[PDB]
Every structure is written in structure tokens, then in C-alpha cells.
Write a protein that binds this ligand. Structure first.
Ligand SMILES: [K+]
Ligand SMILES: [K+]
Ligand SMILES: [K+]
Ligand SMILES: [K+]
Ligand SMILES: [K+]
Ligand SMILES: [K+]
Ligand SMILES: [K+]
Ligand SMILES: [K+]
Ligand SMILES: [Mg+2]
Ligand SMILES: [Mg+2]
Ligand SMILES: [Mg+2]
Ligand SMILES: [Mg+2]
Ligand SMILES: [Mg+2]
Ligand SMILES: [Mg+2]
Ligand SMILES: [Mg+2]
Ligand SMILES: [Mg+2]
Ligand SMILES: [Mg+2]
Ligand SMILES: [Mg+2]
Ligand SMILES: [Mg+2]
Ligand SMILES: [Mg+2]
Ligand SMILES: [Mg+2]
Ligand SMILES: [Mg+2]
Ligand SMILES: [Mg+2]
Ligand SMILES: [Zn+2]
Lengths: 211, 141, 102, 94, 55, 136, 91, 74
RNA sequence: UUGACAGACUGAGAGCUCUUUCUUGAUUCUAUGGGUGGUGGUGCAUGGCCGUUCUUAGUUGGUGGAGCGAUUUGUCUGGUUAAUUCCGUUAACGAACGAGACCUCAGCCUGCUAACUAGCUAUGCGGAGGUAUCCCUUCGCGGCCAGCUUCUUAGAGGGACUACGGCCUUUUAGGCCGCGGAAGUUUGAGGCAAUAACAGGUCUGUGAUGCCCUUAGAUGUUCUGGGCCGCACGCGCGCUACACUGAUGUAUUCAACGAGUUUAUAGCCUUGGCCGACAGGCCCGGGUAAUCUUUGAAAUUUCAUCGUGAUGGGGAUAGAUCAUUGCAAUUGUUGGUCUUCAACGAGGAAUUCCUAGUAAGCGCGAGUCAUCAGCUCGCGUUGACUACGUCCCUGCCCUUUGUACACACCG
């Protein structure tokens, strides 16, 4: 019975809180994202992840636990909110997945340069137009520094950034401090819209071939 | 079939609408005669479309004007613009195009704002200053 | 068995909201029902202006955040069962439907 | 008074009454110490010996007829009056 | 502490009765529209909440 | 000739004179001691301020028939000076407006509107129109 | 931390019956929203379980989320004297 | 100032080269032709390209224009 | 091992502690490890974020050319542009960022769609006025089968592209003027915004974080009280003024961006009625909202008093007293009534912002908020002078040139 403004703000706050909770819980399991759909007397939450086996657990035990805890914390009515697990299509085109992979590789003791180059190569081979990885913090010395790896196209200004650029930031708790990793992937135009924005770049003009 | 037109004049946020139809030649704003429009100083702007053309051309049309928004000067400017546009439209749609063109030409030769709305609008203010361009006083020590 | 059914549509996405309104209008028309609307209320612009810096240093720069809410009103002269059947059509996420009488 | 006194002022008044009763004839009552700086002096409290906490110490006062309807804070200064020394480095040339 | 003493001070209003729902800090709380989030947390989570920067 | 066709100032003066001549008004004993609002610094200069205010209020109800005490306070309010602080809008005295409305209702110039506020009666319309016509 | 036997029994019963449990980080809250026991006692009992690995704890947006493990399930079964057939609703 | 960018210049040159037959000296007709035979994300860009194409056509009517290769002219 | 009646103790109905002795039951206590918390140090260990260099137009590969090499050309003599924007010249050719494009708001549509949560028109009825029937003027109420979308709202679209004319310019890129046009400074204002950097700010936003300190007589947490506001003095951003282009008292009437409830007797915005001089109080109710507050400002306009007098300018300081918020108002929380009536008569050296609906004046909404706005973020109202030029000062970009500078002339 609340006003529309408060209703929409509460919906946004709930989405943000659920996103943060899912990230914290499924950090290691891999968590590309979450989507919330509202239907009459039913709400569906879809968890996009690279490893759905871990998210579901054995016989859906983990996903059932997550659904129950989410309902209890968010006052949802019994048998009214339900969770699904979904594979992420072209995980290399998701910065969150790539950022988590780089975090895992760095925590595993792998060299920063080798890990970043591998991530860059995987992103490029996954069909990305361009990509960039930044690693900042105390690397090899007590003095913090930044390492930048870049390959391909990239835009940084104007509206097309919001749709053609998918970016993520993550922290790695190393022995001597915190390492900040930033992943930035430039998508490619997709007429279907499944793998990229369904809109061409503003300054791209195509002339049809004359008969 | 009723013989009438409705034309609107604009100035800043002021919107005035003149309903002009066949009649004996009366002109009223919100039910009040145009001769009592306030402020008294701007009565000249209010009457300019009337002084330029003469009362004889208005003798055959009744005009009712409803105004909203804006301020004292903007409302009067919208009133006069709406009056001019309503008279021009009425002459166009019930009177010879020759006379319509003549009245339009005489009005425009005096002032183009009588028929064309001024597009000026208040500029949004930017953080770091009280006004759109004015910035906070800067001190170095 | 005829009533003025009031349908309220609220969404943040203008395209989805307009598409849902058009689908409802066409569904009502296909049943030879009388449709009034859609009536588009003034857009609600929730505005928040907060300082960019997480501290008090540097030039005081501010971020203007806006959340736009679009509301539509549709009136149907028909029965509860038929309006319910019409509204049963698929609705994309982000659009809230409310059906009432008067 | 319309809003009503809480239990602490009532306890303070009762303690003052007890001290006055136990005071030997022709002698002042004992010291009643309290933190209640917002207490309002009433005529019944005239002649009582009250220590009022000022945040560091219980300043000693004796209630007089002219102090009725005043707060106990008004008679226990919480700060030391300022006596100015010579300006230090950085006071001028700004 | 004693039940009548421990946490007995009223907290029905003021900055001490409100905290950020994200980080719990009591400063710079945005109460508009019921966000109840400190300014830093809101600036971090605005995109997820649904607040877009147009100007 | 009606009120709308005459200058508001002249009509206000004429109707205040008519109200004073009528003798049906019962001025409160405090009319000579109170300001017209908390925002004012001094009492009204004109001794006939009560009659003038009554005439202006009656004209306002004639023009619009849904006004109340708060509406009249807002109508007759204005800027309030705060010494060294900037000015802000302030409401006017509500007791004066309430008493004037009650007196006008007693004289039958206005009556309670079913939707709230006060409305001009047929007798009030007639009296105001005659005063406007006689102004000439 | 000192906890009444009835409160501990109620907390353990709810945890075993539901398989999960959340709690706002409010030490002075009079009663847990889902359990009549004080929030502080609920939180401290769950912390005790987590210390010895009977539960997995997650924190986010000033809230605790606790998920029972196999060892926690075994301990709760033994302590509540429930039949082996009965299991938490999650499974 | 009003200086057409490389995008507008290249688009106009290519459009004139590939569809010189249907080109006209009227800006509205040229912009309609551009809408028909090209995909321009922005209406402002479409109008700018159409205007520059009209100017280039006016120059071509006078004589050869460097950077544009017309089969009939050659 | 917990809790506690009474007395004492205590600022204290803190069993905090002591006396007196009851209750509870392995949940605790003691010691050793290990934890936990900390607005505790370290921003010269860090992440993220933000500010600045830097609002300017700048920045970098591949393959070629030159040099032993650091490097260099591309990235340029010239013209042009706000622009490394283009035209061209060319040992460079092709490219990738930045710019532009882009997106938001505003400006035009009597064209499209649709509006009982927005309006207009005419009609029917009724009130008032005028010759009082019929006629004219102005108001109030109904018509979901009166019509409509000019006015209001919001979706799709159209529209401007220097399109057209005259001159200058390399037959170029382009520039000035001009009719028309809503719009001819990139239409106006914003959002976004490259490479490389600062030991610039933030550990006091974060359950971000390493190390160091503390960790039970605590740097943890809570309660009481005080302080952060303390006043010989110096400085910064501001509010109010020095008055008649005015103050006061009447009358008069034109905005926009926005914000609003747990219904409990009732919580947020509050209409109407009554009480009161005001401040405020009481009672019916509306609004989870284009439905109600919202019928919603001041400057300004008009008529009088004042009459060059620190004066009816100015409102600092202070006394008395009355209300509201709050558990608590004293060191006045804020708000009313009367009374007191300070400097200030336009401001030195210096110094800030600003080119059109802009400066300036005027008020209004929101953030903070139980109660407090002289502040910040936005909004509209009235509305200008001057210039449309330059590198003189302060700086910025490119080129040439000198250097004993490279921590880079604060060398
Ligand atoms: K930093
Ligand atoms: K090279
Ligand atoms: K630290
Ligand atoms: K904070
Ligand atoms: K210079
Ligand atoms: K330059
Ligand atoms: K030399
Ligand atoms: K050199
Ligand atoms: Mg770009
Ligand atoms: Mg740009
Ligand atoms: Mg502490
Ligand atoms: Mg630093
Ligand atoms: Mg080479
Ligand atoms: Mg070079
Ligand atoms: Mg329209
Ligand atoms: Mg530093
Ligand atoms: Mg301070
Ligand atoms: Mg400032
Ligand atoms: Mg108004
Ligand atoms: Mg004086
Ligand atoms: Mg004065
Ligand atoms: Mg300067
Ligand atoms: Mg402040
Ligand atoms: Zn926060």
C-alpha cells in the first residue's frame, strides 16, 4: 500500500541486496549475475553462473537452502519465491566471470603477467572486439604499482559505453595487502541482441551495394 | 455551425489563449475588460495589436482571453501575441486572404513578437555557483 | 454485466510499457470492447544529488541521479472475466499491472 | 511540570527531605550530591546543601529563596572563565 | 550490564537511531524515498538500484 | 455593470463605505489594538481598516466560492523581515478573517459551502452588483 | 556465553527443522523475528556452531545467513534425540 | 565553426560514387535517397551527410572533383 | 557458576560493591594457546572512489624510411576549425584512443494516437446585473450517448542541413553578411570523456585491507554529566544595511522544480469549522497521490503617512513574559507580544564572478530534520550595462631556438 516511488526504490534496493548476497555466497562457485522477474503471486530469481553444479549442489540441496534463506530474510511468502540456476552464454564476454577467474588464478600463485595475458587471450578468442585488464597494488615490492594489459578496440566516452562496454571490479586479499583487478570488455554489434547490443555505433555508416 | 478560432500566445512559462468568434467587438480577459488589465503601465503593450489595426477591424469579433502561468509582464505579452494570432487566424478562415495578409504585414512591420513566440528560457543552474554562470567567490589565502 | 475496469500500468522502461499498453489495447479491440486510453500521467522523476567524493577533499562535484517512473491508465467497459482473460497475456519484467473497478 | 517529573527528580527531592529532617537543629543539612543539572529549584528546596555535578566535580551550593524556578545547571559552571595569555605562533599574518 | 541501564538511553530519533542498511555507518544517510543508505554506499549501488545519470 | 467591470480599488472603497453605512457589522473590541498579522510591524493606519478588509474579503468570496480561513491568511500574508536573516513568506492573522467571515454570514452575504469554505449568496451577489453599478 | 536451556533447545530445533537461518546484526533486539529467543543469543549460538564447523556463515548488508552442514545435522540429531529418519526440510 | 568530419565526408563521397545516377541537387530528395540506400544511426548525421552530398553534387556538375571516381566521367 | 528482597554504598530502583542468605544448575569460573572488537597509528604499505595536472587537444602500435644508438617520420610548410576538425603537402601507408558522433533537458508542430486522475467549445438548468420574460454580460452544477484536443499531459514522428542569395578564400577546406525560418555561435545547457602522472585526499563510509598497538582496571561496548559553541586577537565563504529608485499601512494578483502516512483515537502533507491578538490548541475529514495539501510566493503594481533628521533607515545587544518539539531547552533549540534601539552616512592597499533570459534583485521546493538554514542542490519571477577584441597581466596549446636543469627554475 506504499506509493509508487517507494515501491520502485524498494525493488531496486532489494535487487542490489540480493546481488550482493549472491556474490558473497557464490564467490568461489562463480556468479555471473542475477535476474528478478515478478509475476502474479510468484517471483522468480535466476542465478547466472559458470558452474551451476556447485550452485545447485547434490540434488539441489544448495539451491533449496538459498531459496529458503532468501525467503526467510526477505519476508517472502512460503512457496512464492523460487530460484533457478542458468549457464552463462559466452562466459568470456562477461567481465564478472573473467574478473573472478583472474582472482582465482592470482590467488593460486600464478604470475600476474601470465594470468592477465591468458585472460586477454581467452576474451579475444571468445569473440570480444577488445579488452583491457588492470591490476593495481603492491606487486613485487612494498611500493604499489599498476599493470595495464590491452588488446583490440575500446571506447571510453559517450553513451555507447553503457551498452558496448561491460566492466567489473574486484578485490583480492593477498598476504601483503589488497590487489584491485579491473576487467573491461568491449562487445560487438549483434543484430539478434543475444551476444551484443542491438544497435550500431553512432559513427558507423554502411552503404548497400548497388545492383 | 459556430464561427470561432482559438489561438495561443507564449512568453516564458506564460500561456494565453484567445477564443475569437463572431460578435459585436468586445474584448475581455478572464471576464474582465481589457481596459482594466494590470499593471497599468503595460496597457500599451496589451493594446498595441489594437492601436496598430484600429477598433473597426475588431468591431465584428468577440474575444475571450484566458491566461495562466508566468509573471505580470509575460502574461501581458502572451495576451497580446494571442490576440494578434487569433485575429489573423479568424481573418484567414472567415475573411479574404488579402485582408488577412494586410493585417499580418502591418503587425509584423511593427513587431515580429506579436506573432512569433520568444524562445528564451531560464538556464539551469550548475553546481559550484548560485547562478547559471555566476560562480562562488574564490579565495587563495 | 458491464463495468468500467481500471487498469494501471507502471514501469521504468518506456518501450516495454508502451508495448504492453498496445498489446492490451489490441486485445480489448479484438473482443469488440470499448477502450479509453492509454492516459499517460506526468512522468515521475525521482532525483538524488550526492557528492562524488567519498571524503571532503577536492572541488565539490555532484552526481545528479534520476529514476523515472512512467504510469499509464486504461479503462475498459467489459466484465471481470473478460478483462482477466485479456490481462492474462504475457507481460515482460519491469511492468506492474493493477486491475480494479472504479 | 505539566509533562511530569521522572523518578530521578522525585528521588532527589526525597533525599533532600531526608537530609533536612536529619539535620540537627540550628545546623545546615548534609551535602546531597547529584548529576541532575536539569532539575528545577522549588521553594521546598530552600536551605538545602547540594553538590551539582559539572562534568568533573560536584560544585557546592546552598539553596536560596531567590533561586527558585531556576535550573541547578545555572549555579554550577561547566567551564573555567577564559583569561587570555599572549597570542602564540600563527595568530596573525593570515 | 544491568537491563535497566545497558542500552537504556532512548533512540527514537536523531542520527544515532538510524544507520546505513548496507554498511551500518550513521553518517550521511540518504532517507529520501526510504533508501536509508549512506551517500557512499548509494553512489556505489546506484546503478543496481536503478538510478541513471542523464545530466 | 458588475464588479468585474470596475476597478478593484474603487469597488473596495465603495463597498467598505456601504458596509460601514449599513451598521450591521459588529466590530470586535480589539480592532484598534491588533495588527493584521504577525509579519506586520504596526497596526493599520486607516481607522476603517476593518471595513476595507471586509469589503476585500467579500469581493474575494464573490469571485471564488471555496475559500477558507487559511486561504485568506495566505492571501493577506506576505514577506516577514527577520532582522539580519533573509525574508520568508508569512501568514496573516486568522482571528480577523474568521470574525469577518462570521459577520458577513450574519449579514447574509455568504454562507457555508457544502464542499468547505464560504460561498457568496444571491443576496450578496445582488448587493455587490448594485454597489458596482452605483460606483459610476 | 550463558544461554538458557530452553532457548538453546528452541534455537537448535528451529535450525534443524528449517536447514537455514538469518539474523540482523542487532545485538539489542528483544526477539529474533523467526525465533522467540533474543537476537544476541541466536547470533552467539550460531557463532559457536560456526567456530566448530557445524554451520556455514555468510555476511552481507548487515545480516547473517547460516546454512547447516552434515556435521551440524549429525550433532543436532544426536542432541535433540530425533529419529534418524527425520531430516531438515531443505533436503 | 561548421567543418564536416571525416565520417560525413567519407560517407558522402562513397554514396555519391555508388549512387550517382539517382542523386539530385535538392537536399530533401538527397536525404530521402540516403535514408533509402544507407543506414545512418542518427538523423542529424543523415542530414549532414545529405547536405554535404548535395554540395559535392553541385561541384561535380561544374566539373571533376578530386577523391570521387565516376564511371561516366572517366 | 547465575540472579535477587531489605539495609548501607552510589550521581543513580547499576546486587556496581558490602551485610544478611535465598534461588539456578555445568549453559559457566580459573590458567595456558588462539580469537574477537577498536571513528586506534600508518593514505609515505594498499584496493576502490574522488580532485588535480588539463578544458586544453592531445596520445600510442603494425609494416615501411633515417640514425650505431637513446630516439625519429607517420603526428607536417601553408590555409581552415572550438577541435591532431578538415583541405592539402608529403618516406610514408594503413590503423587504435581522445574530439566529433552519442544520450538527457529546453526551444517549433492548430499534423498522428489517446485522455471523468487535464482541459476547451456549445447546449440544459439556476443566481446576479442590464431593456429584466424573448435579448446581452458574468458566475455555479450536471451530460462515460454533446463535440473536440487549440490550451495540459506523454508516446511515435517531422523539423536545421548553413538549405538558399551576395561577397572573400587555392575551381578546396571554409569564413562574413542577408531573406525566410521556432531555431543560422556546435540552436542553448549538460552528461560521458584519451595516454601518463601526484608519495594531492580518504584507514573517521564500508563485515575493503597488510603490518604495528591495545584486548577485561580494555584504545571493545554501554550509562550519567560535560565538551566539540568556551574569547584580548587574525583570516575565508556569506546574511542584513547605510535609504525617498526608499520605510511603513492599505488595496491589488502572476510561477516552476518538487515532497508527502504504521492508522494505532493518531505517526507524513494537511484542506474545512471553532477557540485565540499572535504564537498555538480542539474537532470533522482528503491524500500511498495529474484524484487531496496545490483555490498553491516575493520582488513588483496602486493609494496614503513619513520629509534628508542615524529619521517611521538599520536591527546588533538586552529585560520581562507566553507557546511548540524533545526523556531533558540552563550555555537563551526554535517560534510569538511589549520594551531597549549599537556600529553602519557607500567602504584603503588589494581582490572575486560574469557576455542574454546571462549579471544582479525576488522569492519557492528538496538535502540535512523530534525541533533548528544566514549553507548546499534545483526551481521559477522581474530583468540590465558593456564587448563580441587582445596577448598588456595571469596562464594554456603548437613550432623554432639556448641550457652547466632531469628531485626537472620552488632547478
Ligand atoms: K589511494
Ligand atoms: K614506426
Ligand atoms: K588499517
Ligand atoms: K557514511
Ligand atoms: K598573454
Ligand atoms: K594549439
Ligand atoms: K646561450
Ligand atoms: K635539450
Ligand atoms: Mg570515441
Ligand atoms: Mg564528447
Ligand atoms: Mg569506541
Ligand atoms: Mg596519497
Ligand atoms: Mg622503425
Ligand atoms: Mg614524434
Ligand atoms: Mg494539443
Ligand atoms: Mg600524502
Ligand atoms: Mg565544530
Ligand atoms: Mg563555498
Ligand atoms: Mg496564482
Ligand atoms: Mg531609528
Ligand atoms: Mg525599520
Ligand atoms: Mg582572478
Ligand atoms: Mg553544512
Ligand atoms: Zn553505507
Amino acid at each position: 500500500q506504499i506509493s509508487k516511488k517507494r515501491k520502485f526504490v524498494a525493488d531496486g534496493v532489494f535487487f542490489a541486496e540480493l546481488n550482493e548476497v549472491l556474490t558473497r555466497e557464490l564467490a568461489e562457485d562463480g556468479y555471473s549475475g542475477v535476474e528478478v522477474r515478478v509475476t502474479p503471486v510468484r517471483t522468480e530469481i535466476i542465478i547466472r553462473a559458470t558452474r551451476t553444479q556447485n550452485v545447485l549442489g547434490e540434488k539441489g540441496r544448495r539451491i533449496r537452502e538459498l531459496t529458503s534463506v532468501v525467503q526467510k530474510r526477505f519476508k517472502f511468502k512460503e512457496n512464492s519465491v523460487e530460484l533457478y540456476a542458468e549457464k552463462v552464454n559466452n562466459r568470456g564476454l562477461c567481465a564478472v566471470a573473467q574478473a573472478e577467474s583472474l582472482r582465482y588464478k592470482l590467488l593460486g600463485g600464478l604470475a600476474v603477467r601470465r594470468a592477465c595475458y591468458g585472460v586477454l587471450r581467452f576474451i579475444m578468442e571468445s569473440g570480444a572486439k577488445g579488452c583491457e585488464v588492470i591490476v593495481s597494488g603492491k606487486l613485487r615490492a612494498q611500493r604499489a604499482k599498476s599493470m595495464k594489459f590491452k588488446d583490440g578496440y575500446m571506447i571510453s566516452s559517450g553513451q555507447p559505453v553503457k551498452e558496448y562496454i561491460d566492466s567489473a571490479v574486484r578485490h583480492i586479499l593477498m598476504r601483503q595487502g589488497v590487489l584491485g583487478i579491473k576487467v573491461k570488455i568491449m562487445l560487438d554489434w549483434d543484430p539478434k541482441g543475444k551476444q551484443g547490443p542491438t544497435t550500431p555505433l553512432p559513427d558507423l555508416v554502411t552503404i548497400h551495394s548497388p545492383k | 455551425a459556430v464561427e470561432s478560432v482559438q489561438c495561443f500566445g507564449r512568453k516564458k512559462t506564460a500561456v494565453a489563449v484567445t477564443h475569437c468568434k463572431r460578435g459585436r467587438g468586445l474584448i475581455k480577459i478572464n471576464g474582465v475588460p481589457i481596459e482594466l488589465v494590470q499593471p497599468e503601465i503595460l496597457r500599451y503593450k496589451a493594446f498595441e495589436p489594437i492601436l496598430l489595426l484600429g477598433r473597426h477591424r475588431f468591431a465584428g469579433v468577440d474575444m475571450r482571453i484566458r491566461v495562466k502561468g508566468g509573471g505580470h509582464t509575460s502574461q501581458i505579452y502572451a495576451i497580446r501575441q494571442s490576440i494578434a494570432k487569433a485575429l489573423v487566424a479568424f481573418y484567414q478562415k472567415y475573411v479574404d486572404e488579402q485582408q488577412k495578409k494586410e493585417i499580418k504585414d502591418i503587425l509584423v512591420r511593427y513587431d515580429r513578437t506579436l506573432l512569433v513566440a520568444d524562445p528564451r528560457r531560464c538556464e539551469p543552474k550548475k553546481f559550484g555557483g548560485r547562478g547559471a554562470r555566476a560562480r562562488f567567490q574564490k579565495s587563495y589565502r | 454485466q458491464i463495468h468500467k475496469i481500471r487498469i494501471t500500468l507502471s514501469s521504468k522502461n518506456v518501450k516495454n510499457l508502451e508495448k504492453v499498453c498496445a498489446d492490451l489495447v489490441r486485445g480489448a479491440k479484438d473482443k469488440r470492447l470499448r477502450v479509453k486510453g492509454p492516459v499517460r500521467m506526468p512522468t515521475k522523476v525521482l532525483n538524488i544529488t550526492t557528492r562524488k567524493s567519498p571524503c571532503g577533499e577536492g572541488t565539490n562535484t555532484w552526481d545528479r541521479f534520476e529514476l523515472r517512473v512512467h504510469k499509464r491508465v486504461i479503462d475498459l467497459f467489459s466484465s471481470a472475466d473478460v478483462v482477466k482473460q485479456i490481462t492474462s497475456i504475457t507481460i515482460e519484467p519491469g511492468v506492474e499491472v493493477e486491475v480494479t473497478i472504479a | 511540570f505539566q509533562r511530569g517529573l521522572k523518578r530521578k527528580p522525585m528521588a532527589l527531592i526525597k533525599k533532600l527531605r531526608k537530609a533536612k529532617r536529619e539535620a540537627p537543629p540550628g545546623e545546615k543539612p548534609e551535602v546531597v550530591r547529584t548529576h541532575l543539572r536539569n532539575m528545577i529549584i522549588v521553594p521546598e528546596m530552600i536551605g538545602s546543601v547540594i553538590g551539582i555535578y559539572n562534568g568533573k566535580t560536584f560544585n557546592q551550593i546552598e539553596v536560596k529563596p531567590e533561586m527558585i524556578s531556576h535550573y541547578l545547571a545555572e549555579f554550577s559552571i561547566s567551564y573555567k572563565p577564559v583569561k587570555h595569555g599572549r597570542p602564540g605562533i600563527g595568530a596573525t599574518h593570515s | 550490564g544491568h537491563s535497566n541501564i545497558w542500552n537504556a538511553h532512548p533512540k527514537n530519533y536523531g542520527p544515532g537511531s538510524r544507520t546505513c542498511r548496507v554498511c551500518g555507518n550513521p553518517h550521511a544517510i540518504i532517507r529520501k524515498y526510504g533508501l536509508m543508505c549512506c551517500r557512499q554506499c548509494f553512489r556505489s549501488n546506484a546503478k543496481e538500484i536503478g538510478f541513471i545519470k542523464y545530466r | 455593470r458588475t464588479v468585474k467591470d470596475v476597478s478593484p480599488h474603487e469597488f473596495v472603497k465603495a463597498y467598505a463605505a456601504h458596509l460601514k453605512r449599513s451598521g450591521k457589522m459588529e466590530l470586535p473590541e480589539w480592532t484598534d489594538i491588533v495588527k493584521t498579522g504577525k509579519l506586520k510591524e504596526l497596526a493599520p493606519y486607516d481607522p476603517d481598516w476593518y471595513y476595507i478588509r471586509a469589503a476585500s474579503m467579500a469581493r474575494k468570496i464573490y469571485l471564488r466560492g471555496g475559500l477558507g480561513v487559511g486561504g485568506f491568511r495566505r492571501i493577506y500574508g506576505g514577506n516577514q523581515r527577520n532582522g539580519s536573516r533573509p525574508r520568508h513568506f508569512c501568514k496573516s492573522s486568522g482571528s480577523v478573517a474568521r470574525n469577518i467571515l462570521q459577520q458577513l454570514q450574519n449579514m447574509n452575504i455568504v454562507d457555508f459551502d457544502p464542499k468547505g469554505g464560504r460561498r457568496i449568496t444571491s443576496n450578496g451577489q445582488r448587493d455587490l452588483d448594485q454597489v458596482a453599478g452605483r460606483i459610476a | 556465553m550463558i544461554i538458557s536451556e530452553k532457548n538453546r533447545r528452541e534455537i537448535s530445533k528451529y535450525l534443524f527443522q528449517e536447514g537455514v537461518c538469518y539474523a540482523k546484526k542487532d545485538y539489542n533486539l528483544a526477539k529474533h523475528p523467526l525465533i522467540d529467543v533474543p537476537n544476541l543469543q541466536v547470533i552467539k549460538l550460531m557463532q559457536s556452531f560456526k567456530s566448530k564447523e557445524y554451520v556455514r556463515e555468510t555476511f552481507a548488508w548487515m545480516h547473517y545467513y547460516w546454512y547447516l552442514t552434515n556435521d551440524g545435522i549429525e550433532f543436532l540429531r544426536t542432541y535433540l534425540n530425533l529419529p534418524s529418519e527425520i531430516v531438515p526440510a531443505t533436503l | 565553426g561548421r567543418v564536416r568530419t571525416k565520417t560525413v565526408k567519407k560517407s558522402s563521397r562513397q554514396v555519391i560514387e555508388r549512387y550517382y545516377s539517382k542523386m539530385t541537387l535538392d537536399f530533401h530528395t538527397n536525404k530521402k535517397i540516403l535514408e533509402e540506400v544507407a543506414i545512418i544511426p542518427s538523423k542529424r548525421l543523415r542530414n549532414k551527410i545529405a547536405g554535404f552530398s548535395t554540395h559535392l553534387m553541385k561541384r561535380i556538375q561544374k566539373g571533376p572533383v578530386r577523391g570521387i571516381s565516376l564511371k561516366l566521367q572517366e
